[PDB]
């Protein structure tokens, strides 16, 4: 999610930092017997608690499972999900800056934040940053996403596109019934860029999750368009 066998997720200034920590403590509480939340655990990084560096005791980090472990040369893609990349409490100025960062969000329903794709054609990593995904359009999005699945010179990993789509359909089913709204959240995609399919699809960024009434339509929208783009990549 950020730094550091775990990964250290740096918590953001209040109110964002306390919100993400509340969320994690909520789904991972020991007395949690809410089936929706317990089911949610499947799609998240494992959470091991908080951590401060001895020099900054007021500086808080989440201890998170590093899901790119188990993988030899992992390919990773970060995808923000939804039609808004802002929560309902954002001011007008925030909303304009978020909308102006990617105006097609409203229509495509997801945004590609970054990729790192292992090329066996070169034993090197190809990287895409913020501005690649902020440039894809209705017309280029289908190729844009398929860039992530070009594993070297040979296979364009259909088996990986297929695994991806099954796991995320399962997140589609959870969100098809729930009590929580996710703004500016993302999915993390990992697959194996060589060998030692097997893929990871995890939900990750949680500083803007809110109690809901009720079904999160912006998120089901974005999920649905992403399964669309991934289905047609499979054909």
> Has 65 been labeled as part of a binding site?
yes
> Has 204 been labeled as part of a binding site?
no
Q: How far is CA 117 from CA 41, 139, 160, 231, in A?
A: 27, 22, 13, 20
> Has 66 been labeled as part of a binding site?
yes
> Has 78 been labeled as part of a binding site?
yes
> Has 98 been labeled as part of a binding site?
yes
> Has 216 been labeled as part of a binding site?
no
205 phi/psi in degrees, rounded to 5: -90, 120
Compute the distance between CA of residue 4 and CA of residue 165 in angstroms, rounded to an integer.
30
> Has 70 been labeled as part of a binding site?
no
> Has 63 been labeled as part of a binding site?
no
Q: How far is CA 15 from CA 47, 109, 110, in A?
A: 20, 26, 25
> Has 142 been labeled as part of a binding site?
no
Nearest to 221 by CA among 189, 187, 176, 180: 176
> Has 9 been labeled as part of a binding site?
yes
Indicate left, alpha or beta for 49 from its phi (over 0: left) and psi (-120 to 50: alpha). Answer: left
Contact 210, 193 (CB under 8 A): no
Compute the distance between CA of residue 196 and CA of residue 224 in angstroms, rounded to an integer.
33
> Has 87 been labeled as part of a binding site?
no
Q: How far is CA 96 from CA 92, 100, 214, 219, 221, in A?
A: 6, 6, 26, 20, 21
Please give the annotated binding residues for ATP, written as ranges: 9, 65-67, 78, 205
Residue stretches of the annotated binding site for substrate: 16, 80, 94-101, 130, 208
Per the annotation, binding residues are 9, 16, 65-67, 78, 80, 94-101, 130, 205, 208
């Amino acid at each position: 999610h950020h730094h550091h066998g775990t990964v250290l997720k740096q918590l953001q200034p209040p109110p964002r930092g306390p919100r993400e920590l509340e969320f994690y403590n909520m789904v991972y509480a020991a007395d949690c017997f809410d089936g929706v939340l317990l089911e949610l655990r499947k799609y998240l990084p494992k959470y091991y608690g908080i951590w401060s560096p001895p020099t900054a005791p007021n500086d808080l980090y989440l201890k998170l499972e590093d899901v790119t472990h188990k993988f030899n040369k992992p390919c990773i893609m970060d995808v923000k999900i939804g039609q808004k990349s802002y929560d309902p409490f954002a001011s007008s100025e925030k909303i304009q800056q978020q909308v102006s960062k990617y105006p097609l969000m409203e229509e495509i329903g997801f945004l590609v934040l970054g990729m790192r794709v292992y090329h066996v054609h070169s034993d090197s990593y190809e990287t895409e940053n913020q501005h690649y995904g902020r440039s894809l359009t209705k017309e280029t999005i289908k190729d844009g996403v398929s860039r992530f699945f070009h594993n070297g010179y040979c296979l364009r990993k259909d088996a990986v596109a297929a695994s991806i789509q099954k796991i995320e359909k399962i997140l589609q089913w959870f969100e098809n019934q729930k009590q929580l709204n996710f703004y500016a959240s993302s999915l993390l995609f990992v697959y194996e860029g060589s060998s030692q399919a097997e893929v990871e699809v995890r939900m990750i960024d949680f500083a803007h999750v809110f109690p809901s009434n009720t079904i999160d339509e912006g998120y089901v929208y974005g999920l649905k368009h992403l399964i669309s783009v991934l289905r047609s990549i499979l054909d």
